[PDB]
Design a protein around this ligand. Structure first.
Ligand SMILES: [Ca+2]
Ligand SMILES: [Ca+2]
Ligand SMILES: [Ca+2]
Ligand SMILES: [Ca+2]
Ligand SMILES: [Ca+2]
Ligand SMILES: [Ca+2]
Ligand SMILES: [Ca+2]
Ligand SMILES: [Ca+2]
Ligand SMILES: [Ca+2]
Ligand SMILES: [Cl-]
Ligand SMILES: [Cl-]
Ligand SMILES: [Cl-]
Lengths: 149, 149, 149
C-alpha cells in the first residue's frame, strides 16, 4: 500500500535525522566541546588566511575567534603553533573587526602590537604564550575553526 | 512510476543508513575503540554526577563502568583526572550497585575507602593510579561515557 | 498529497546526504586529513595482519601503504609503534606486492631486509625509524588504516 510505505519512509527519515544529530553530538563531545560552550578543531595544517576561511566555512564553522581569556587559552591549546584568528583590519586600516562582523572588543596583543608592519599586516595570529600579533594575510599559519555553542 | 520512485527512495535510504553506521564505526575507531571492547570517551569536562548521567544518556551512552582491571585501566587512561564511575550506594549504604543495575563485581578501592566521609558520599570516582574513592555526588568530576563493544 | 509527500521526501533524503557528507568532512578534518592528501588513522590496537585487513576493510579503507617518503613519515607518526603495511609476498615468496594489487614501487627496507627470516616472513612492518622489516603475518602490530586523498 503506497500510503503505508510513505508513512514508513517518513519515520525512517525522522529516525535517520535523529541518529545523525546523535552522531554530531558524540563527535563534538569527543572533540572536547564543553556544555554550552563553542568548540575548536584543527587538522594542524598551515595555510594562508583566505584558505582557512574557505575551509572553516566549508565545515559550517568560522576561523577561531577568542572572545575572552578562557577561549584564548582553549584555542592556543588546540593549535599548538601559531594560528590565524577570525579578526582582521582589511576593511579599514587600524580598525580590527571579527570576520562575522563587529568591532574587536577583547584582545590579547603582544606588547607593541598591532603594528601593521612593513608593507602592512591585516590579519591576526595567536602566537607564543597565546599573545597576538598582526601578520600578512598571505602568510601560512595553522587552520583552527570554531563551531557554535 | 510512483511505486518505482518510492522503491528507489527506499534503496537510497538503506544506503544512507549503512553510510551513517560506517561514520559511527570510523569515529569510534579514531577515538581508540578496540575490537570487541567498550568505547570510552570524554570531553574532559568536570561536573556533578547528575550532570554526567544526563550528558551520557543524551549521547545514548552510559557513565563509564569498569567491569574488570583492564576496563578500569582503559578508563584511567581516557580520563587523565578524577572521574565519576557509574556506581553508587544510594539504595543501601555500603552496597555499591551499577547505575544500569546489579551488584558490583570488580572494585579497586583505595586504602581506607569507601569511607562515606562527612555528611556522606554515595558516588564513586577513579583517581590516581586508577584507584577508587567514594565521593559526594554533588562534587564535580570528569565526565566519561561508555558505549557498547 | 502522495506525490507532494514523495517529492518532499526526495528533498529530505538529499538534504540528509549533504549533511552526512559535511559530518564526514568535519570528522576527516579532526582526524588530521590535509587538503588533497590521503590520511591515516589508528585506534592503536595491535593485531595480526589478517585482522588489520579485515578491520580497515570494514571501515572502507585499506591497510596503510606509503607511496613515497612523505606518506612513509606520516604513517610512522600516526602509528607511534611498529605497524603493518599493506604489502606482502604471500603470493610468491620474494616478490612483494601491494594488497591492492601491483608490484612494490617505493621501498624503505632496513639493511638486510627483506630476509624471510626463520620459519618465514611474508608481511611488512614500518619500524621505529620509518625503515621496513618483513615479519610474520601472524605477529601482532598496530593497525593503521588509509583513506583516499
Ligand atoms: Ca591595510
Ligand atoms: Ca593593518
Ligand atoms: Ca605585527
Ligand atoms: Ca548513603
Ligand atoms: Ca555511601
Ligand atoms: Ca571517600
Ligand atoms: Ca612465504
Ligand atoms: Ca617472505
Ligand atoms: Ca625480516
Ligand atoms: Cl595583509
Ligand atoms: Cl553522596
Ligand atoms: Cl608470514
Amino acid at each position: 500500500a503506497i500510503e503505508v510505505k510513505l508513512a514508513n519512509m517518513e519515520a525512517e527519515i525522522n529516525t535517520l535525522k535523529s541518529k545523525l544529530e546523535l552522531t554530531n553530538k558524540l563527535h563534538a563531545f569527543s572533540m572536547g566541546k564543553k556544555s554550552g560552550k563553542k568548540f575548536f578543531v584543527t587538522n594542524h595544517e598551515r595555510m594562508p588566511f583566505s584558505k582557512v576561511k574557505a575551509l572553516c566555512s566549508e565545515l559550517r564553522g568560522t576561523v577561531a575567534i577568542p572572545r575572552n581569556a578562557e577561549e584564548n587559552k582553549a584555542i592556543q591549546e588546540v593549535a599548538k603553533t601559531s594560528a590565524f584568528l577570525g579578526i582582521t583590519d582589511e576593511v579599514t586600516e587600524g580598525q580590527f573587526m571579527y570576520v562575522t562582523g563587529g568591532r574587536l572588543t577583547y584582545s590579547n596583543w603582544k606588547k607593541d602590537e598591532p603594528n601593521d608592519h612593513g608593507s602592512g599586516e591585516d590579519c591576526v595570529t595567536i602566537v607564543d604564550n597565546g599573545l597576538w600579533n598582526d601578520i600578512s594575510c598571505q602568510a601560512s599559519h595553522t587552520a583552527v575553526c570554531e563551531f557554535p555553542a
